[PDB]
Design a protein around this ligand. Structure first.
Ligand SMILES: [Mg+2]
Ligand SMILES: [Mg+2]
Ligand SMILES: [Mg+2]
Ligand SMILES: [Mg+2]
Ligand SMILES: [Mg+2]
Ligand SMILES: [Mg+2]
Ligand SMILES: [Mg+2]
Ligand SMILES: [Mg+2]
Ligand SMILES: [Mg+2]
Ligand SMILES: [Mg+2]
Ligand SMILES: [Mg+2]
Ligand SMILES: [Mg+2]
Ligand SMILES: [Mg+2]
Ligand SMILES: [Zn+2]
Lengths: 39, 64, 77, 193, 103, 136, 140, 135
RNA sequence: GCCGUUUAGGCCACGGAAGUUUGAGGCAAUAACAGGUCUGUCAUGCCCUUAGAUGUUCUGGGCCGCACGCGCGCUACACUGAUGUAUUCAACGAGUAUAUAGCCUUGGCCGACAGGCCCGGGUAAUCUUGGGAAAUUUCAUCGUGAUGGGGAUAGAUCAUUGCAAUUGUUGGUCUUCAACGAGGAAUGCCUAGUAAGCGCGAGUCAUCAGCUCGCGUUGACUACGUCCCUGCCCUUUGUACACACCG
């Protein structure tokens, strides 16, 4: 009973820091949120 | 009866052997500081090192 | 070396190591250790590790204690 | 060489003489640069070639005691074994325990070996000389392994397995793992000359 | 009359935040206020590692996203209007100001 | 010196090796572990730096009392191994050959039960939910 | 005015050796230096002292507070803290050319009683559970 | 005083002191307990209870504000779980709490404001007096 | 400083924190593969079904089943050790109104462990936590014995999570004490804070970490090379190959 706020997927979900994104929709929106891939 | 004879590596020639595991060197006999013959050393060896040699007649050839 | 299996066989506490033998077993190289005695004599430990104290209270030798239970032995003087 | 500095603060480095001038260059014992209180130094050896020839030799012995996984890196334990070991050596020999080890390094290092070289276009093992630094490296290796194997599943302690090993090796008796492994290497190498 | 007013600054941007930080300091230094700052706080670094693939195939390869967060503090011995009289300069994009009245 | 020294002790039909140390010779009984062996020695008040073939006949008597009768020497309820039994309801500390029985007696129940854990033992396959593809 | 606060570093062990012009005290977090608790790696802490001398310390006292690292790294740390703190005191309070003798005692023995190791824990990278080690590879 | 003396040999002295310093009470669960979840056997030594006291009478001497949920950590250790990897394990608090109770009744330590357990004015004396009585 | 068309550059040496681009990572060309992903995406053509549904929803079961073969691993086969004392040194991260204390949880008390009851601190360099980590270091006990190594298997009971624990969620207590004596043919990773050892944090998460991603702690042996095996780049050469030598 926890899905992605973007797509509604039940798997690979990231609750860390309260994003509630799946591991794929996050990667799609990662830079927009402001997670810079410094390394 | 061979007598263990000492020599000194004057210089280093190459790294022979299939895997390169053999440094070829020129040795300087201490009893007679005139005999410069090729020998084949295993292990890290620079000039100024002293090789113990059981025999001496066994002489390495060029690019042996 | 059944030398914890031998700790109560009456030979031991009668004399076996009260100079019955262990005059000698240091004298192989004159102060051979508590553990060389422990295996240069085929008998091993803990009949010995009790007597490592016993000969010490008897004032025949001087001894050490440390980490691995390394312990030492001396003959005379 | 000058300096009254001693290992564990008990054993003098002067009055140790290394006979074979062949590897007198790589026994880091004799010169006053090599004297150290403890065989434990975090020196950046292995950084360059031949640099580990400068490591004090009692440390090189110590470094090799830490093998087979359950001993890797446990250097305080390894050095503590060394202290007990030299207690035992002077206990059994009443000579300079430093002399014993360096004589045990010098007697148990193979002077020859067989390597697969190819002359004329066909390869096979052929007889070769051994450089002094690998000889020291090999002399250490044989002693430590032999002491290791005997102590395993033995009531005897490692410190004293090491001690018997070094005493027998410095004498040169055919009683040490190092001695028998040395002579089988020479005999093979002699045959394939 | 003379209180303990603390201004707290957070942002995702090193350069941008020290623009505001120094301006506030030089803002009040021109008023000769008791300005005790900036106390520089350990940078927080939010982190996410995610598998690069959408299908779990190929050499498993990981990308470490992260976010730096910088924490700055200024002390002013001043009034609730002197603090606001100063802190009215153009706050640069995104920088967080949360002035509160300390103890 | 153990002038009468015994090499075996036969306690509770188990042939206890007398040249072991007490607490580590008593564990040879089926039902006495190292923990419970220790506490028996404490309550019987017997020196541990002793080899069991050196130990006296009276001392064995006290040891056997407290193991057959643990609840009367204030042994707390939680050292025992038949806690809250199903037949009588009592709290007992089973010993050498009664262990061999009650195990099947438990098994015999569940086999008559038609329990899953009974038919699991009956088939011989693993009983506790461990996977059973390529192990065991 | 004799007061110097000189540090030494190893991996994470940082030691700060505050000094005053006293008689002989050397205390690590208040505890005597003669008691630090690798008793095999005790000569390493004592190493600066047997290098220079108890005499060189006859007018100074040492309080060497430590934090971080491990056990071995700290002993290599206190070594520099003691060794460096002496020359900084000598540089500032005794003579500049009476410390040139002291330095060459420390430097001819070991070069790392004045200058730290830059060596640090290389980061872990994925595809394996070490800095260099990689997960075991299987083909069939 | 306390820091000039070996933190080991000294506690032997203080373990011989709480024997013969009169006496106190002592649990009727003392000789069974393993002192931790992860231990294999109860403490070997008979007079371990005072050694645990003596070892833990220096804790408050050399610190301040230690509760029972922290005293458990101080004596915990590694735990081997057989098949599964070993971890850290926190020891038991019944032993730790009671040692405090006894030394509380005896005037070496007291309960502490701001939370914890704090050393007494006069208990500091004996931990420094017996400290002087060590080689 | 020697070497070199004395060019570009090479080896070394004092100095220096540092002389493999100082270390390690991020990014990373053209052309492709019928590589994987329609089961991440109300991204998606075509086809199938569309109320007696391949839609949704609920109950229960299964994905976990066990003759067997395989891969990554954990724990070991002990004395360089097991246990029981005493002693004590990190770093990276983490705390969604979490409801009437609530996620991280200090301190008090009850309790043998497990776990409770109580007063609270912290939306955090402020409280948890300066994260009192383990290996280690000491001191004893064991004594070459499938032993007190090892901890599979199983019996009895207790407590916690949750709406629910059965095909044991897990954590306790007692008891049970298996294989394993360093592993054949084969084969992996690895060149200095590295390998190896040790533990910690985070993801998942109500509960479960033998996993993965990070962190620190102790800390080496060996090599400073070659093209021999496996492959890669460039040139020359031969081809009856072009889905290209698996031709
Ligand atoms: Mg042994
Ligand atoms: Mg382990
Ligand atoms: Mg680079
Ligand atoms: Mg897709
Ligand atoms: Mg599955
Ligand atoms: Mg994998
Ligand atoms: Mg065990
Ligand atoms: Mg231990
Ligand atoms: Mg976890
Ligand atoms: Mg290369
Ligand atoms: Mg042709
Ligand atoms: Mg064609
Ligand atoms: Mg063909
Ligand atoms: Zn999504």
């Amino acid at each position: 009973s926890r899905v992605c706020r973007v797509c509604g997927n039940s798997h690979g979900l990231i609750r860390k820091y309260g994003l509630m994104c799946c591991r794929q929709c996050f990667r799609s929106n990662a830079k927009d949120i402001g997670f810079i891939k410094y390394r | 009866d061979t007598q263990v004879k000492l020599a000194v590596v004057v210089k280093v020639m190459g790294r022979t052997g299939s895997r390169g595991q053999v440094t070829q060197v020129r040795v300087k006999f201490l009893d007679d500081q005139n005999r410069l013959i090729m020998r084949n050393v295993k292990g890290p060896v620079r000039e100024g090192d002293i090789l113990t040699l059981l025999e001496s007649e066994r002489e390495a050839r060029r690019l042996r | 070396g059944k030398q914890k299996e031998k700790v109560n066989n009456a030979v031991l506490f009668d004399q076996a190591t009260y100079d019955k033998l262990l005059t000698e077993v240091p004298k192989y190289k004159q102060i051979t250790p508590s553990v060389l005695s422990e295996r240069l004599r085929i008998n091993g430990s803990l009949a010995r590790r009790a007597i490592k104290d016993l000969m010490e209270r008897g004032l025949i030798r001087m001894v050490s204690i440390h980490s691995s239970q390394q312990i030492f032995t001396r003959a005379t003087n | 060489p000058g300096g009254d500095v001693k290992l564990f603060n008990r054993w003098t480095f002067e009055d140790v003489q290394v006979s074979d001038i062949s590897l007198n260059d790589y026994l880091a014992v004799t010169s006053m640069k090599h004297y150290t209180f403890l065989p434990h130094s975090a020196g950046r050896y292995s950084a360059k070639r031949f640099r580990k020839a400068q490591c004090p030799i009692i440390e090189r012995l110590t470094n090799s005691l830490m093998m087979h996984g359950r001993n890797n890196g446990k250097k305080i334990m390894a050095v503590r074994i060394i202290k007990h070991t030299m207690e035992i050596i002077h206990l059994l020999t009443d000579a300079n325990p430093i002399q014993i080890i360096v004589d045990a390094i010098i007697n148990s290092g193979p002077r020859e070996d067989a390597t697969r070289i190819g002359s004329a276009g066909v390869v096979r093992r052929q007889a070769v000389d051994i450089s002094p630094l690998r000889r020291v490296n090999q002399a250490i290796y044989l002693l430590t392994t032999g002491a290791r194997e005997s102590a395993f599943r033995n009531v005897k302690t490692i410190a004293e397995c090491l001690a018997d090993e070094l005493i027998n090796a410095a004498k040169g008796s055919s009683n040490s793992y190092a001695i028998k492994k040395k002579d089988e290497i020479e005999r093979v190498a002699k045959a394939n000359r | 009359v003379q209180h303990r007013i603390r201004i707290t600054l957070s942002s995702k941007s090193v350069k941008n935040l020290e623009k505001v930080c120094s301006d506030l300091v030089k803002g009040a230094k021109e008023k000769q206020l008791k300005v005790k700052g900036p106390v520089r706080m350990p940078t927080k670094v939010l982190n996410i590692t995610t598998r690069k693939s959408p299908c779990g195939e190929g050499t498993n390869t990981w990308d470490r996203f992260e976010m730096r967060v910088h924490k700055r503090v200024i002390d002013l011995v001043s009034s609730p209007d002197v603090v606001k009289q100063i802190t009215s300069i153009t706050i640069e994009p995104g920088v967080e100001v949360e002035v509160t009245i300390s103890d | 010196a153990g002038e009468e020294f015994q090499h075996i002790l036969r306690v509770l039909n188990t042939n206890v090796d007398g040249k072991q140390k007490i607490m580590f010779a008593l564990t040879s009984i089926k039902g006495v572990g190292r923990r419970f062996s220790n506490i028996v020695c404490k309550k019987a008040d017997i020196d541990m730096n002793k080899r069991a073939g050196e130990l006296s006949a009276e001392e064995m008597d006290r040891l056997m009392a407290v193991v057959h009768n643990p609840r009367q020497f204030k042994v707390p309820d939680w050292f025992l191994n038949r806690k809250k039994d199903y037949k009588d309801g009592r709290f007992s500390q089973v010993v050498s050959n009664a262990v061999d029985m009650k195990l099947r007696d438990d098994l015999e129940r569940l086999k008559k039960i038609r329990n899953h854990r009974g038919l699991r033992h009956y088939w011989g396959v693993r009983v506790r939910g461990q996977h059973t593809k390529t192990t065991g | 005015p004799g007061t110097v606060q000189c540090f030494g570093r190893k991996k994470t062990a940082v030691a700060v050796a505050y000094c005053k012009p006293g008689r002989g005290l050397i205390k690590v977090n208040g505890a005597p230096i003669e008691l630090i608790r690798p008793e095999m790696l005790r000569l390493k802490a004592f190493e600066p002292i047997l290098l220079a001398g108890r005499s060189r310390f006859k007018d100074i006292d040492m309080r060497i507070r430590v934090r971080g690292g491990g056990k071995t790294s700290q002993i290599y740390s206190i070594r520099q803290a003691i060794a460096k703190s002496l020359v900084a005191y000598y540089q500032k309070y005794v003579d500049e050319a009476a410390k040139k003798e002291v330095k060459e005692i420390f430097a001819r023995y070991d070069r790392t009683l004045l200058v730290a190791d830059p060596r640090r824990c290389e980061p872990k990278k994925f595809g394996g559970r070490g800095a260099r080690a990689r997960f075991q590879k299987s083909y069939r | 005083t306390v820091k000039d003396v070996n933190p080991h040999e000294f506690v032997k002295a203080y373990s011989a002191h709480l024997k013969r310093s009169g006496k106190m009470e002592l649990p009727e669960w003392v000789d069974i307990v393993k002192t931790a979840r992860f231990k294999e056997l109860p403490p070997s030594d008979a007079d371990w209870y005072y050694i645990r006291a003596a070892s833990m009478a220096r804790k408050i001497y050399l610190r301040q504000g230690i509760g029972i949920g922290g005293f458990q950590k101080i004596y915990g250790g590694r735990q081997r779980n057989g098949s599964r990897p070993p971890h850290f394990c926190k020891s038991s608090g019944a032993v730790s709490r009671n040692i405090l109770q006894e030394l509380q009744k005896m005037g070496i330590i007291d309960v502490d404001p701001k939370g914890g357990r704090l050393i007494t004015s006069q208990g500091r004396r004996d931990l420094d007096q017996v400290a002087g009585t060590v080689p």
